[PDB]
Structures are given as C-alpha cells and as structure tokens.
C-alpha cells in the first residue's frame, strides 16, 4: 500500500539538481533518521532516500536522468508513491 500524491518539483536555484518536499510528518508515519524508500514519479521507479532537512523538512532528490524520462522539470507537478525499505 504506497503513500502517494502530487508534488511540485523544487530546485535549489542555479543548481543541476531537483527534488520534491514530502507533504507529510515523515518522524511519525516512518520512523526517525533518513528512511530508504521504492520511489515512483510518474510512474518511474526509483529506490533512495527521504532526508531530513531542517526538522521538520523532508525531501527525496529527483534524478536529471529521471526528470529526462518523464519530461518534467522543476516548477512541474509530479505524482510521487513512496514505500518503504
Ligand atoms: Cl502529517
Ligand atoms: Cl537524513
């Protein structure tokens, strides 16, 4: 059963990398400490880590490679599931 919703692909500006913020209070639903996750984004798999930024700030990186096979860039909305590892 994924936990599963849509999320605005953020980027640190000037930076080649991207990433969605967890809309949820990731520290209750899964635990402490980083949390490896079988990640889909638009229905592409992927297998990393939600991080914590500052508390209570979540995110899970999005790929170039990735963001390429889906055709999205940030400031586009992605569906997003997340299971846990
Ligand atoms: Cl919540
Ligand atoms: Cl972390």
Redesign the pocket.
Do not use: S
């Given at each position: 059963s994924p936990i599963e919703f849509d999320a605005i692909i953020r980027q640190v500006p000037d930076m080649d990398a991207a990433y969605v913020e967890i809309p949820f209070d990731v520290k209750t639903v899964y635990g402490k400490?980083?949390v490896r996750v079988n990640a889909t984004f638009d229905g592409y798999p992927y297998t990393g880590y939600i991080?914590?930024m500052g508390l209570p700030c979540h995110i899970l990186g999005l790929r170039q490679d990735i963001r390429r096979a889906i055709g999205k860039q940030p400031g586009d909305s992605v569906y997003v599931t997340l299971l846990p590892l």
């Open positions: 400490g980083r991080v914590r």
